[PDB]
Design a protein around this nucleic acid. Structure first.
Ligand SMILES: [Mg+2]
Length: 97
DNA sequence: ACGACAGATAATTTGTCACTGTACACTACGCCTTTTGTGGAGATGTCTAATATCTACGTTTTAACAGTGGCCTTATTAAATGACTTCTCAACCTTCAC
């Protein structure tokens, strides 16, 4: 019925091969998204090599629930003015969830 | 008129065969996460019979001695000894003898 009423979360394998800072191949990361079902903002993400795990879920949840701050190395013109807790959380059946 | 006989005729499917688009190019049941009932110690808590100890229960044994009980004959006369008691503890005069 309103914003934050149901957040939704899932993970997927990003389709970019990453590299170490020394330049050698690192297998693709996983991306986790937390999404407002009303508003349809993306509320927060976690991007990393760690497989789908409750610590990864918790890491996306932290970013989503908390206010956002980014420095000038992020050349943003907008601002990611979204925060606050969900009232419900809607997921698939993964063992992390 | 319309439609109604037997047969024409535009479909409809059955069957040929030259052509071409494509896979074969090895390269998923495998990586990763979570729950979970079974299992191995290993610190810790549980709580007894029992072989004493550890005095007392008091109970025997001793000897000391205290009390009861039996026995013990009694007389006279003499002696020795030691004592006791009582009594006594004059004094002047006369007479005849040298
Ligand atoms: Mg999912």
């Amino acid at each position: 019925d309103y914003s934050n009423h149901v957040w939704q979360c899932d993970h997927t394998r990003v389709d970019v091969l990453l590299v170490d800072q020394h330049g050698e191949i690192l297998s693709r990361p996983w991306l986790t998204t937390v999404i407002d079902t009303y508003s349809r903002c993306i509320m927060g993400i976690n991007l990393g090599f760690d497989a789908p795990s409750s610590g990864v879920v918790a890491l996306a949840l932290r970013h989503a629930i908390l206010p956002k701050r980014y420095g000038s190395e992020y050349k943003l013109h907008c601002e990611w003015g979204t925060y606050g807790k969900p009232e419900h959380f809607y997921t698939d059946g993964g063992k992390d969830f």
